[PDB]
Design a protein around this ligand. Structure first.
Ligand SMILES: OC[C@H]1O[C@@](CO)(O[C@H]2O[C@H](CO)[C@@H](O)[C@H](O)[C@H]2O)[C@@H](O)[C@@H]1O
Ligand SMILES: OC[C@H]1O[C@@](CO)(O[C@H]2O[C@H](CO)[C@@H](O)[C@H](O)[C@H]2O)[C@@H](O)[C@@H]1O
Ligand SMILES: [Cl-]
Ligand SMILES: [Cl-]
Lengths: 291, 293
């Protein structure tokens, strides 16, 4: 699969594309601090049934690095512009981490765009720190509190590259090979290049802040609970942002939401479960399109 | 949790494995020769979160009863029909391989309203000549099955030598089964006479018009399959055995609502090499269909 590039809002976004184009479109949306790289072993399993498009968010992967704030709403604007530039009129969405917030927000604003939503390890408004990660992961809670602290977050993420070097491997059960880890590092050679990686944890909707993202994601979650398109939720054990127990309650709170149990898994489920995820998604799309 | 149970059927009994919530769609898993519901053991746990899974042992196979019958294709049809009635199943997805597919196609042709969807692989079709049985690189397989179908020779190979269990079975699996995995394939068949149903099957294969009744039934069943409107999922291995990848793409494209799922390296007993891929595929597919209805 070639990396391709699209002009977007006077910058550019890199993307991977595969599959016959007479088929329904599936948009794969990564989060922090990843790129379309994370889908690399899932795309070949979905491409036989769908036209797969996996963009790198602005400032991630091989996308352009404009001098912007990289707030959640900036990503929204770039992703919307990418979809427009690609001429995509409707799609399935497959999302993880911040990709899920983009998917939920897109579905809320354009309900007729969404053929279905496959998601995992998703972002929701979290009224307190007890709603961010699980009780066995107090240490993750403490790290993100630091990311959200002026000066401290800069030292950890911009200077020490902690999100790429510590958080990412900490959210994968297996140990990535050198050749698998390398493309996670290459987008972020410098402190300045790491700006988007610091901006994201500062956007997490926790304890009412930031108020604009908190409200947008409350609204997106209300829309999701009122939506009628098919949904497919994956969970790991014990997971990270989403426990198996929360996943069961969440899926039951929605209509037309299946829950697929992947087994031992933390945050970056794609890395531990690419085959299970790809096979599940391809079957699910095939089933929906049949009927 | 997966339970092994027994249903009374036509004066005998069939064993079956069952798992999943009772308020979910039913999925009926149908094995072929010389296997049992054992072959689905690693697939069931992956489908049970979305469906009520029922996996019977065909009459004379696995832990089912061994009544004094011919074990022809139409006998299996009768026992499977009676099992379905006994379990009070009114509609189901079918998941099938080998002779399981002939049973599924024949069921779907008679009762298409019963079929929620059909997931199948390595399936039986009418074969006008021996050239239509396996691929030309497997001449050895054709000679072996010709001998199975030959009076006297088949008895020596399958009943006395247990060749279907000991050679044909492992021969259609890419990996080597662990001893604990292979053992339950042997235990239903302790004696030559217990192997009667295993010998009966190759002699039922619809090759060159013989047997005429099965050939006719499977022609009619294949015509129905070609016209059918229910969702279908075809899995293929490379090179496969009864179904080549090239044949699979053409066959799937010919049908209405048929997705093709390529599994990679595989022979005949694809479940043993690809349980995870098959289970995950079937679960996502059922979830998708039931979401839209
Ligand atoms: O039933 C399989 C699977 O489908 C889902 C949606 O993917 O639920 C659908 O089917 C249920 C049983 O028929 C219905 O109760 C439900 O309303 C419908 O959306 C999954 O929830 C379920 O595991
Ligand atoms: O489209 C994905 C996948 O679905 C199948 C059926 O499972 O085809 C369906 O979708 C096609 C594209 O929308 C339709 O043209 C077709 O009629 C419908 O059955 C598979 O064939 C396909 O790979
Ligand atoms: Cl983050
Ligand atoms: Cl046979």
């Amino acid at each position: 699969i070639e990396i391709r590039r699209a002009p977007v809002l006077g910058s550019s976004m890199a993307y991977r594309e595969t599959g016959a184009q007479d088929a329904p479109v599936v948009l794969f949306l990564h989060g922090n601090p990843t790129s379309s790289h994370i889908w690399r072993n899932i795309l070949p399993l979905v491409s036989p049934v769908a036209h797969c498009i996996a963009p790198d968010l602005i400032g991630f992967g091989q996308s352009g690095k404009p001098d912007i704030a990289y707030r959640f709403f900036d990503h929204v604007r770039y992703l919307d512009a990418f979809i427009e530039q690609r001429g995509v009129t409707s799609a399935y969405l497959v999302a993880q981490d911040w990709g899920t917030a983009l998917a939920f927000h897109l579905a809320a604003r354009r309900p007729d765009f969404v053929r279905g939503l496959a998601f995992m390890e998703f972002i929701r408004p979290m009224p307190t720190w007890q709603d961010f990660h699980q009780d066995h992961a107090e240490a993750a809670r403490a790290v993100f509190r630091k990311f959200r602290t002026p000066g401290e977050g800069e030292a950890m993420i911009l200077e020490a590259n902690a999100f790429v070097e510590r958080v990412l491997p900490g959210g994968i059960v297996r140990k990535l090979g050198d050749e698998e880890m390398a493309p996670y590092r290459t987008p972020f050679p410098t402190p300045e290049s790491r700006r988007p990686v610091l901006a994201f944890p500062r956007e997490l909707p926790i304890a009412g802040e930031p108020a604009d993202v908190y409200e947008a994601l409350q609204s997106a979650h209300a829309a999701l609970a009122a939506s009628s398109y098919p949904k497919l939720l994956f969970t790991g054990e014990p997971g990270a942002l989403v426990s198996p127990e929360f996943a069961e309650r969440f899926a039951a709170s929605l209509t037309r939401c299946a829950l697929i149990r992947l087994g031992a898994g933390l945050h970056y489920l794609q890395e531990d479960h690419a085959d299970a995820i790809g096979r599940s998604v391809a079957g699910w799309i095939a089933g929906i399109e049949a009927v």
